[PDB]
Amino acid sequence: QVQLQQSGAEVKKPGESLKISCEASGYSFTNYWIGWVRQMPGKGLEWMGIIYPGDSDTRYSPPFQGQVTITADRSITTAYLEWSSLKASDTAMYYCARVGRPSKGGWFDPWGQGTLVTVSSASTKGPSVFPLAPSSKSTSGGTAALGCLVKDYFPEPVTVSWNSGALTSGVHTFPAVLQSSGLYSLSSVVTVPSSSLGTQTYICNVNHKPSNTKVDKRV
Amino acid sequence: DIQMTQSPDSLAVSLGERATINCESSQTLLYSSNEKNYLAWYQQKPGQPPKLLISWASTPESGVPDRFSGSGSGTSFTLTISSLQAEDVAVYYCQQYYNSPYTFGQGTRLEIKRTVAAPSVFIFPPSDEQLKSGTASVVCLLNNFYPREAKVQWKVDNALQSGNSQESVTEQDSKDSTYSLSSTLTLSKADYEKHKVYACEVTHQGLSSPVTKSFNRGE
């Protein structure tokens, strides 16, 4: 049925240009408005604009008027979103979505799965993985916390597992924070019985694909 | 340009209780000719694209559970969850499709309200490994608390710090409905070795008074 297949995640330097795509199928591409929604990290949906591929007519919301250009290519049933000079604050998820009824304006249905755009002056860097050691002595009779600090990588994302996936209870892997240096940093923590500290071994498994960094850190 | 204001920004409802999300437009969305309200509701779960729940104000998509209803007319609309279930935790957006741009509301974050739970607080000195690199990160973990509001203050030899910390918070836990928070203090390696006492003081509803967890460098 209806599919809206968006292009892959982009990582760009400020000043570069960028055109992302959304390939539509399962309906008559020229009989529906189709458009774009921005979602900056941690914030709401922003309606950017829409295009009617039957006559290339477009609509934009004021904050995106003169910032981006939406086009479409009837011959390959594809809609596009284009920036001439990206800035860092263009970093966001970008959804393609078709208007939910033909030939008229309306709500969005269905939605694409999204394209993440990261705009930064930083270059790819693998994380350093530091132990966050328990500290709470094995004879306390209570609960201990321990973790791994996954610091200074670019770009997103990193994955963290514990004991190769055998340790999932009590694990919290926090959302990355963007440090002022422009590199990301996150911690993954787990709580375990103190009485286990002397016997059981705890190892965090960090993978950062964009740098092909894979690290196992014993803590 | 029609502005869409949702209330509240964030909503905490006990399981099985009624959840009410309001949406107000700056202009009426009622078309007097067909008596239709040009208003959609969307649900967005974390890590996923938005999904259409309701069109024409009072009209759920097929398969939308019967505990969802949409009401209102003109400038005043309401999404109602008659009996909040775990699967309903999400951000909900209204959107008007009366006049382009088809603007979204700013979003209402719906969470489970549960009994107040105080954080378990853990403090982690910088690791010897990290110490090598002229960087020091002191990490304070707040584990399994509710509600999500919390304050971390960092002290270094009892000098209150500001500007040199970043926090990150998890999604509400699917099984216990609590949050966890990670706060990282960044110091130069040399500053870290110039001072002795490192403490994070935590303020939270569930604590009768603020708790301080401290350590002394080099024990």
């Binding site: 009989n31 408005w33 009617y52 039957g54 006559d55 007519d57 609509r59 030939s103 008229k104 304006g105 309306g106 | 078309y31 000719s33 040009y38 499709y97 009366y98 006049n99 382009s100 088809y102």
Partner: peptide, 12 residues
Amino acid sequence: EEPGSETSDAKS
């Protein structure tokens, strides 16, 4: 007035 989505945005 009347909705743009049924008028200025409507297509054939």
